[PDB]
Design a protein around this ligand. Structure first.
Ligand SMILES: Nc1ncnc2c1ncn2[C@@H]1O[C@H](COP(=O)(O)OP(=O)(O)OP(=O)(O)O)[C@@H](O)[C@H]1O
Ligand SMILES: [Mn+2]
Ligand SMILES: [Mn+2]
Length: 152
């Protein structure tokens, strides 16, 4: 069922970001929806891989060929890793945040994608949607947002 797929995706994101946040492993994971992401998938290394927390983690290990860029998730696949997302030029984004967050914000401005960031400098988990930044959300907060947004 798609329902079981969507819940597995939530769990996959929750576990991998939780693992990566404890270890300050930067990460950037964009989930596409009605708005196509195919142009950005094509900038990356194709994976077309089953979604799992273990793969998400392995991708973002630092100084590895897959980690520099965004993971894009399309349907029930990790479509691509090391993809480019457009950067927000928004002057409202805090300057202590980094390029991952600016990239997470840029794509949320031009798609309806849900994107999730792990800061390598703080371990905070953030989320972007519709040009909004949810900064350093708690585990419970991330759970409800992903539940609300990714389960249809
Ligand atoms: N357009 C983009 N799309 C996706 N990833 C990007 C883009 N531009 C930069 N990145 C990623 O942003 C990271 C920038 O590395 P850098 O050493 O500058 O850390 P940083 O931006 O301070 O980190 P953080 O935001 O996690 O605190 C690199 O992984 C680079 O792959
Ligand atoms: Mn599962
Ligand atoms: Mn790097």
């Amino acid at each position: 069922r798609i329902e079981r797929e969507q819940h597995h995706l939530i769990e996959s994101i929750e576990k991998s970001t939780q693992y990566m946040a404890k270890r300050r492993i930067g990460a950037l994971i964009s989930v596409a929806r009605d708005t196509g992401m195919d142009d950005y998938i094509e900038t990356g290394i194709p994976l077309n891989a089953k979604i799992s927390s273990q793969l998400l983690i392995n991708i973002f290990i630092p100084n590895t060929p897959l980690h520099d860029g965004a993971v894009i998730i399309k349907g029930n696949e990790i479509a691509s890793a090391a993809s480019y997302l457009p950067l927000s030029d928004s002057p409202f984004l805090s300057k202590e945040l980094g390029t991952r967050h600016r990239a997470a914000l840029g794509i949320s401005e031009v798609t309806d994608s849900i994107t999730i960031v792990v800061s390598e400098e703080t371990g905070g988990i953030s989320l972007t949607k519709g040009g909004e930044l949810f900064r350093d959300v708690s585990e419970e907060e991330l759970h409800k947002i992903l539940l609300k947004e990714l389960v249809t």
